[PDB]
Amino acid sequence: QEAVAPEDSAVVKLATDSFNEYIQSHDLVLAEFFAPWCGHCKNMAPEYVKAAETLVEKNITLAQIDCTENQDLCMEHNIPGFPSLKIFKNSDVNNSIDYEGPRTAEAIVQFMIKQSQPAVAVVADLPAYLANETFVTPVIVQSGKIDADFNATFYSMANKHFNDYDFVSAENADDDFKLSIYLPSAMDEPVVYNGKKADIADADVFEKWLQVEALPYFGEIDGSVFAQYVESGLPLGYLFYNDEEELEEYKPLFTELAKKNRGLMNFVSIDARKFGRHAGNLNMKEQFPLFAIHDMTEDLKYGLPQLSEEAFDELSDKIVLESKAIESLVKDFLKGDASPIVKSQEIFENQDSSVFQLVGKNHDEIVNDPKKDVLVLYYAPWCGHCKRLAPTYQELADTYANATSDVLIAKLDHTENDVRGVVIEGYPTIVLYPGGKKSESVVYQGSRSLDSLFDFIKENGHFDVDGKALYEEAQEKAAEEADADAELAD
Amino acid sequence: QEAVAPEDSAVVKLATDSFNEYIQSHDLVLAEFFAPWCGHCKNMAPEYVKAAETLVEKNITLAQIDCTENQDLCMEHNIPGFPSLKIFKNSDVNNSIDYEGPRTAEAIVQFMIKQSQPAVAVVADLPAYLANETFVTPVIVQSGKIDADFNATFYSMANKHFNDYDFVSAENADDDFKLSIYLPSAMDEPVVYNGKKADIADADVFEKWLQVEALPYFGEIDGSVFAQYVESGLPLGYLFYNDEEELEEYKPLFTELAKKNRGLMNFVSIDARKFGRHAGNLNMKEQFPLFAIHDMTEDLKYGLPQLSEEAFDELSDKIVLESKAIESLVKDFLKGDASPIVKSQEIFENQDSSVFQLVGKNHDEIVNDPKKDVLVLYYAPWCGHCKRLAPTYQELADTYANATSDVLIAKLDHTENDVRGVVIEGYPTIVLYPGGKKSESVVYQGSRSLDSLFDFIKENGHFDVDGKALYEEAQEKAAEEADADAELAD
């Protein structure tokens, strides 16, 4: 029988076909990269088997990898010598602790309780657990009587999700089903979970629901939490605080909102002392306390109509957001009604160069008209790549200025300027806009060369406007104009 | 040439060998699961190529999967029909949006800028970016001149890490190297990064360093952040607050600590209003403001020696932790000096049953002595599995009581009782302890049956004590004792 763990043995010889798909799925794999002629790799094989049939009840993994035939997999894994007992934990293909401890069953049986991962916490009285075990972590919990599509979804998710929650799987069987989520703020009030189950027994379904409900109705907005506030899709309404009397005068109201509109939009507070400077980033003046919504999906900010500047300095009395106003904003937004507020800077009373500095207000207009074939540099004043560009962009624009004006070549600063139309997250985004005879979603993708745009602006151009030919014709005309020949010779 | 993207083409025909290892490594894969005889899958192949050689500059993935020969991979992926243009984003093997948009190069070239992932943010003036772009997210940034082991580590990590930071890769080339981390609290002070580089150009190396330095020296302790506060290994020192005068009287001091001891131990605050109930969980009375350390690695809590109870109620004046005391604790701990504090309840003046209820104070003692072979149930009063046990445990203990006392059978409540010795995270942990003639790390693993322990306690027992034989002998003796026969017959 040599060194095989045969078909009858309680082990699955993982092959090269998919070591990694098997590893990273399983919560805690125990490998054995081995060779057959290695006496030791035979001369402890009954022990691997004896720590096999017995060790499946804490579903332990036995994994013989015949590095003879499964050779190319020994490459993607830095094997020292045979037998190799590098055993993987959370189960990525990095953590490979080459365990040099005993090669017995009754020995290493114990080492499978080296990192016991008790994710699920079965209880008799939750009251106790909940109160004996205080924690900053919200906890998922189920009681009642557990379905099949559940023990290995609830235990499953948890198993690979302590980076997130506490996972009690309690079951006072004399009880109908249940799936609460005890949030660290108000534990009195857990989660009314509506029971469509067989579909909410997988990810991203089971998942998205935690991603929704595991967020404290009205918590603070850490850098940390702000991740999963955006892993949401729900527009969050930011409120700014100066004092905590200011926080806690408001803190009930927003909880009560977030409760009703739970699934539609989110809510957070935000110390204004450390983040007044965000205010504008939500198109909003630094007057506090400041409530504002942000449609994260399409980049649209809605503020509670902030008070005027020519009464800002003149205002010793403080600032107060009447609840009545707070709601009416929220409802509006969701009705598809509230006013979003672009940052049109003041419109440039015609100044220097052939590159038109554009604004939100005009942009909507100028980009359209069929006269002319306007190109647009959507930009911000800081990035490296968007400034090593305006030099070309000028000697680009200048070439078209002189020649039959027509094709406008313009730039628009996305700092202090929202645009309703098309955009990439990052700058310098470049776009050409023919007009109302044909569409304007004609995004520039390529190099920076004067050359490459001159292509584009004719190639993908309504008028078919050979700017290069100009840049030929032009440089010739400026080669002669100066030199007078007759000055002197030789 | 039929429908092959040949060796000369700008595409890599991913095979079944490892689709997934290729997918989940790459930030944004664009698949084409195809068959050769599918006219359309030939009749748009030059377009895949024409959107190949040109589209590698935003390293786009072209992936032909010949579902003829790579068939078993079509199973692990729910293919509709040929050609299939299910293109994967963040790149797990779930998100498979079967894109039915155009089958041209100059068309779908654009759709590779559908989810542009500008992770890196190149800038000319960081000052602007930093200030124009306010955010709750700390930002990693490098200037100077970037090494090879860096663009595709910095860009790399980021690429799959917006769930964490903002990643500016700026480079005012006229400058020596640099890797700061601008933390959202004090941006004035970024990160003095010490320059051993070629090693800090990988994970978990580059990683662990963010995992260290990206945490605000002295932030609050959200449920969220508490994850990565434990993904650390650094003991964090918790301080509790009642007021913010109480917070901000202390808030400078702890920052200054966390700065010096940056790598050794961490620091956080914690509203006592919502979490007084944790206090005990750090072996600590609910007197506030309360500073305490927690050695997360070995479960050891160190408090600033909280004031007495018989002067608790008598104390109208408030509570104050003198800085001088705060430091001296920290130093001590790190010297390997400070006192950790077990929760020994009061020692049970001999009461009811054959199961000895143990305490921290005694436990150290009783577990040891060679007389006798003590078994120990390490437990908590709530879990399901640890109470469906004491019934056996009694009719276990009783069997040994009557018979030559010797082997003690005991239980120890881990709620209101720390144990210095061996433990599993979860209960009911069971252990037998012979003594000073042989070691005591003899952990019970198995069923609950009276049977299984009776094995254990002899099998792995110093005295070799057949309890089963008793449980034979015993039940016989209680079969006779009662029935008097002569009462009546028939």
UniProtKB/Swiss-Prot annotation, chains A, B:
Pfam families in UniProt: Thioredoxin (PF00085), Thioredoxin_6 (PF13848)
Highest taxon of source: Eukaryota
Family named by the database record: Belongs to the protein disulfide isomerase family.
Subcellular location: Endoplasmic reticulum lumen
Enzymatic reactions: Catalyzes the rearrangement of -S-S- bonds in proteins
Protein name: Protein disulfide-isomerase
Lineage per the UniProt record: Eukaryota, Fungi, Dikarya, Ascomycota, Saccharomycotina
Keyword Metal-binding: no
Region (Disordered): 474-490
Annotated positions for site Lowers pKa of C-terminal Cys of first active site: R103
Protein source organism: Saccharomyces cerevisiae (strain ATCC 204508 / S288c) (Baker's yeast)
Entry GO CC: endoplasmic reticulum; endoplasmic reticulum lumen; mannosyl-oligosaccharide 1,2-alpha-mannosidase complex
Maturation and modification: The N-terminus is blocked.
Its job: Protein disulfide isomerase of ER lumen required for formation of disulfide bonds in secretory and cell-surface proteins and which unscrambles non-native disulfide bonds. Forms a complex with MNL1 to process unfolded protein-bound Man8GlcNAc2 oligosaccharides to Man7GlcNAc2, promoting degradation in unfolded protein response.
Active site per UniProt: C38, C41, C383, C386
Gene Ontology BP terms: positive regulation of endoplasmic reticulum unfolded protein response; protein folding; response to endoplasmic reticulum stress
